[PDB]
Design a protein around this ligand. Structure first.
Ligand code: TMP
Ligand code: TMP
Lengths: 204, 204
């Protein structure tokens, strides 16, 4: 049927990016790799400066909105690809959007507020969250990272309790690259061999 | 007490900018004038390209979120100004954001979706909508302006029916510059004479 939207989520330095690349290479020639934030766009370059230069000042709400816009500027391309039968592997998406922003404890920016901008976006057919039991970018400090992880856990916990079965949390503690690759492949293979009709999609 | 947040909304070319300028000129030396979109910022600049050039492609949802972000990157300064006693005259704000986007009739982009990103933003102490019974920028097409008009009315009617008494629709059809100014002042002046507690603020 139509291609699958596979998302791999997780904290900065958990092997997420390495695993997306591996999966991507494995699903060739019919697979695309998408990273968020997509820094090559005009909006993305703004997010880059924000991430890499602590001096670039931008309120939490604003940067948050830029991250959402960055997905919205690409979602049409994503859908077109899936419909044309192409699998897509995403390195970060809505869940990072909500978790990293909500972890800051800024007045008004709760899970609910953080999610709204992304409401309407395609939801992945499969989301894997890599969990482990630098300092180059803004959000890279041990204390914030611990904060984002509890937030990710809290958010994914709600979605799962709310009946979302497409979310699988994967513990990568003391697991090497190819061991993680095998666990992932275990969850991923079954969905790739599931037929999804072209008019069938889920949205946030 | 604190300064007042006075907002002038309306369609393109309905006298809005002239009145804002007039009011700002008369509230001196204690008044700031703020325009949205505020095109001087990095985000403001992307908005400017979108508005002045068709080549610039950006999904309706993405441009919408930038508009919102543009307000959020400036809102902390607006609050600082008001707390410091200065009055603020605004030329467009949250109401334009919702109406112009919701007027597109894009799927999932209804009044509610369009409002979410702005939730939390300080609501003005007084919002005047200049109503009437070019083509150099993107939304300046008679047929689109017509849709935006109807959307603006449905939007303001809802906020009014909810009990927001700070919204005033001023009909300026065939009225001159000095007449509109007098009508605006009749509504504005009572509000400027009202003492507002440093801590009291309303929000979207
Ligand atoms: C996709 C996305 C990323 N992030 C953060 C996660 C990272 O700390 C930062 C850079 O991510 P990266 O290392 O995957 O490029 O972006 C958000 O805060 N919001 C989002 O919506
Ligand atoms: C502030 C704002 C304006 N607009 C549109 C209305 C105007 O047609 C366009 C440019 O405004 P301007 O002529 O007042 O500078 O911006 C939105 O679409 N949403 C917003 O958030």
């Amino acid at each position: 049927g139509r291609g699958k939207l596979i998302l791999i989520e997780g904290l900065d330095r958990t092997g997420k990016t390495t695993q997306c690349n591996i999966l991507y290479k494995k699903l060739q020639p019919n697979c695309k790799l998408l990273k968020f934030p997509e820094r090559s766009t005009r909006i993305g370059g703004l997010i880059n400066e924000y991430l890499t230069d602590d001096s670039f000042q931008l309120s939490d709400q604003a940067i948050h909105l830029l991250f959402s816009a960055n997905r919205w500027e690409i979602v049409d391309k994503i859908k077109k690809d899936l419909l044309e039968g192409k699998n897509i592997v995403m390195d970060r998406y809505v869940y990072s959007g909500v978790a990293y922003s909500a972890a800051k404890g800024t007045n008004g920016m709760d899970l609910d507020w953080c999610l709204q901008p992304d409401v309407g976006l395609l939801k992945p057919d499969l989301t894997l969250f890599l969990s482990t039991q630098f300092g180059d970018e803004r959000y890279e400090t041990v204390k914030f990272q611990e904060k984002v992880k509890q937030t990710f856990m809290k958010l994914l916990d709600k979605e799962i309790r709310k009946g979302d079965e497409s979310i699988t949390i994967v513990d990568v503690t003391n697991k090497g690259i190819q061991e993680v690759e095998a666990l992932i492949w275990q969850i991923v293979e079954p969905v790739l061999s599931t037929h999804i009709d072209h008019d069938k999609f889920s949205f946030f």
